[PDB]
Backbone:
């Protein structure tokens, strides 16, 4: 800044900047629905949070990382896991679930301490998960497997999915209600001009 | 298997295997407390789930990926995020939180469809998160920053953390109650001998 410079020799928000008019103007790092679709289609690992009744009776979340696949026409995501708690905290044959998918990039150094950050893209999906049975479960597992092992074909590359396989596996469909997407994927963190710049080891 | 082989020319759980006597005998992929400590000390990204009151009044979880640091002596993990919902679903000045840290390896192909899997290590930490203030918040942010940017020193590499910085940042301490660790990090998925083996493209 001028003031600091002049003091040594003895607001940025309103001053000129460059703007690409095609960049998202959404506040709070939020992204479009199409962006969210695309991120979900290209990911292969998610974390799912569901609520379990704890010792004090209060609901609390688990977080389980797992393979998943987004099935856009059906409006769901599929996954399998045999992780459970004691009782689920909710009524009914399905349960509310939150699913998160992210792409984590690099840590971005700065000479301004609260500008230190990590590149990210993250989606939260809110909906209702239900366990699948029979052919619904077989088809979901097949889509998942063939999605995350591209080129693998169930019944050719692998033996077919048997009735025993199904009996021993909890396979879910998370039917989507709402979703929320965020990105902050700068090439460089914001720096503070009036403090010594980062040395070459940090950005080079 | 013999039976399949003999039929072509016309239980494994109890038959011989090799066992390294130093391998964990814990069921359900569970790991020791020391293993959990070590994984938490070496990670830098976590996902945190906290509960918010939704439209229907029921608590539901968010999942936010963020940088973190484990402070073993204090018995907490620290992180910062300005993500919120409307009202938290709980009473008091802190809130229950679940934090997950994982290491995700490779997808492991198999000719047995329910042996398809991903290498993983995952910890869930259960405790209570509280927002920090003043010097407590400054020290937590400094530990975090210096942990995830090794060699960076707050106040040398960066300008010091100011009172304005603190006012604009929600900095948390998750005080640990309990934790749970799992690993399944095989070099190869289990295969089915009685189906054609995977071609060289899969494991080579």
Residues:
């Amino acid at each position: 800044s001028y003031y600091h410079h002049h003091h040594h020799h003895l607001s940025d928000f309103y001053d000129p900047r460059e703007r690409d008019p095609s960049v998202s103007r959404r506040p709070q790092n939020r992204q479009s629905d199409e962006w969210i679709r695309e991120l979900l289609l290209r990911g292969t690992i998610a974390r799912v949070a569901t609520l379990w009744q704890g010792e004090d009776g209060a609901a609390f979340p688990f977080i389980t990382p797992l393979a998943y696949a987004y099935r856009p026409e059906q409006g769901d995501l599929v996954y399998h896991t045999n992780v459970v708690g004691r009782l689920r905290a909710n009524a009914g044959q399905g349960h509310p679930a939150t699913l998160e998918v992210s792409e984590i990039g690099q840590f971005l150094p700065s000479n301004s301490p609260l500008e230190l950050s990590v590149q990210y893209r993250s989606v939260m999906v809110f909906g209702t998960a239900r366990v699948l049975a029979g052919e619904d479960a077989r088809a979901a597992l097949t889509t998942l497997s063939e999605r995350v092992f591209p080129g693998l074909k169930v019944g050719e590359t692998t033996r077919p999915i048997s009735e025993d396989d199904l009996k021993r596996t909890s396979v879910y469909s998370l039917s989507i209600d709402r979703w929320s997407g965020k990105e902050n994927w700068a090439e460089q963190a914001i720096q503070e001009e009036d403090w010594p710049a980062l040395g070459p080891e940090w950005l080079g």
In short: Chain A touches chain B through 58 residues (CB under 8 Å). Chain A has five helices and seven strands. Residues 1-204 of chain A form a domain with the Pnp Oxidase; Chain A fold (CATH 2.30.110.10). Residues 134-148 of chain A form the longest helix (15 residues).
